[PDB]
Amino acid sequence: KLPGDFGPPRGEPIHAVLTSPPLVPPPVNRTYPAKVIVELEVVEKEMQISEGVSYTFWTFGGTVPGSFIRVRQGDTVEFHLKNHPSSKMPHNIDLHGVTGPGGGAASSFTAPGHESQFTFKALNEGIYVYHCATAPVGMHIANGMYGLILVEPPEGLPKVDHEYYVMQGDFYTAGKYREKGLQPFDMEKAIDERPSYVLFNGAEGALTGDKALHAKVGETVRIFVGNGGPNLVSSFHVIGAIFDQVRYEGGTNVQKNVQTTLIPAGGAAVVKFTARVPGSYVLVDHSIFRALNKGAMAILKIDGAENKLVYSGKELDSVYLGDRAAPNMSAVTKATQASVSGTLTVQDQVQAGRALFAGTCSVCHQGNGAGLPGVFPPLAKSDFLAADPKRAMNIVLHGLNGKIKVNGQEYDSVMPPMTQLNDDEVANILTYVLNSWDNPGGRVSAEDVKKVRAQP
Template sequence: MRKLFLALAIASTGALAESHTGGLDGYEVGTPSPDLSNLEHVTQTLVTPPATPEHSLEPPAEARVVKMEMVIEEKEIEVEPGVFMWAFTFNGSVPGPMIVVHEGDYVELTLKNPSSNQLVHNIDFHAATGALGGGDLTVVAPGQETVLRFKAIKPGVFVYHCAPGGTMIPWHVVHGMNGAITVLPKEGLKDKDGNQLTYDKAFYIGEQDFYLPRDENGKYKRYATPAESYADDKKVMDGLIPTHVVFGESKGQLTGDNAMTSKVGETIMIYHSQSNRPSYPHLIGGHGEYVWERGNLADTPAQDLESWIIGAGSAGAAMYTFKQPGTYVYLSHNLIEALDLGAISQIRVDGEWNNDLMEQVVPPSPMSE
């Protein structure tokens, strides 16, 4: 079975790259590799979502080479108690980690596919230019690694995902193999009047839609290997009706004790991606004070939205300053998907209550006749 899947992936992507001197096979390199020796080389430590890596909103004086490593891991996850799925992950998390760079930086990724995995993988950066977003230059079979470098010339928030070719693409994507990269604009974030916008903390929500097969009795099936689930997975996928829509890898992952945290007066940025379907974020009790629905951070943001749209295969961003304490719910306002399928999270905010903004004038009491 493993050999069959390797063959399918290789056939759908073309032959595995034996060697690349830089460019795409079959095309003459017209512009040589730049001399980057004089640029600052920094290593970005990638972290598990909803956390984002340490970063500054101040643009660097000149472009840098920002280096990071991702290790592909195929592993079984528990989507809800007793319900299991083989996930294909970047760095072991669903979604993969957020990357943050500045416009003009060079992104240099080392991508590793350990021999313990079964499948061929690669990575397609929607932020990159050419070669299927790097997908053509990053095809790695189990036991291989590769290094991709691209120049981040387009500012914004962008999806990345595995794209090994053909029907393997949606199968890998809806098994968690996706993430996002933020390319901060050279001029920084600005409002409609040109004023600089900043935030104190950023969260990354990578929304997932899963399509898990059931047996004849309606019980979710469990598989010994990822390859064994493919045929059943595809039948459910092709019906276009997800069994789960979650923020992260499981129902309730970002609620209760695992809720995100903030405090009154703190400005947060929520980066939100959906690699396969639209989503409709809403912050209950708050607003999208500044919103870049399509992740176009160099443009003027929309202001004071109650809900917004993340397009399929894209990422967006919304900024808000908390004014009241309490537990806020951040969800997709397709309420069926949020409350029944799992597209919901919480942000626990500490601070003092402001009665000027809201108060209970009369508590509940028996109605007078």
């Protein structure tokens, strides 16, 4: 007998309602197998991969990851793929969980402006990645062509308070991390498995700040977690919490009470979380430079009463979360646009710099620039800053050590170089500082920084 042998489809054909991340369709809530009609459209479009950084994404349903599909084991799925006429590339689909060559790939080949269809029976319960399977496949996947399909067990999953959809991917831009402008795909970095960004849900900050996932103390949360790759394996982890359950694909095995779990490239898992105490819980790839240097962080924010018997401490802040502690970094987007338009004002720079100062600089110099006397020198009303703005550019790029005097006090410490900051970021940060805390005002330009970077 084949698995999923629940007989022919019955009832009426069901048009599947698909959802955009990070939301999930409702439970199927059905006791009979059905014919389920799935309609998905490929759209190629520019979107912001980071503030001020555009990328040409290739998408299933207009999002990265693509629309979530939810069916029942034993269903007959009539899958329709449409390729929007604006597309330049052909596309197709391989759904993990399909029983048949290519997971649908040969029969779903769809040129721009065309449609295709194929039918499969969902024999296999589980959570599964789907992705494009069009040569060059790695390029298509790298450009965002992946999503999740859930094939429910016949009785449904246990009830929870919230269900969310989170998918990791690695991305390959010609430019470096946070370098502004429309960034091409970089095939050489992709072949070498050297991503410039590693993201949840297609963008930096997609699930942080005002875009966080939400729940309340006492509630249960199920997260459908994909790893589209193309190349990286996620050391997937929740900061400050534990997973009650982790189940990979449709596996019989269920691990319970783990905090860190390896998700293969192309893999998927269902995790369950129970909210205990309020605050922000961070989903990360614990290959930690991905999480804290390339974008791979997402937030589940829990509302409710503190329990000092369980945890006496404070909510997360910019020391750990960096510049993603805040609701958003919209000022960076605005300043980048203003630079393109040739209308960049001092205030545009100040507000972008404010956003970027958090964590990056405030960890040592404090959010108010006061530092810590004799330990971390002040940026507030700083004589040393005022005396030489070009020196300040060199300090950000190249670091500073040795004995200095600031506001009448000696320091003898080490500020590491921060050369990974882009010219606009340094410029904006320093313009923020110059226009705060009784400093002398004025501005630093990206071009000013470019010149210092070329001659330390």
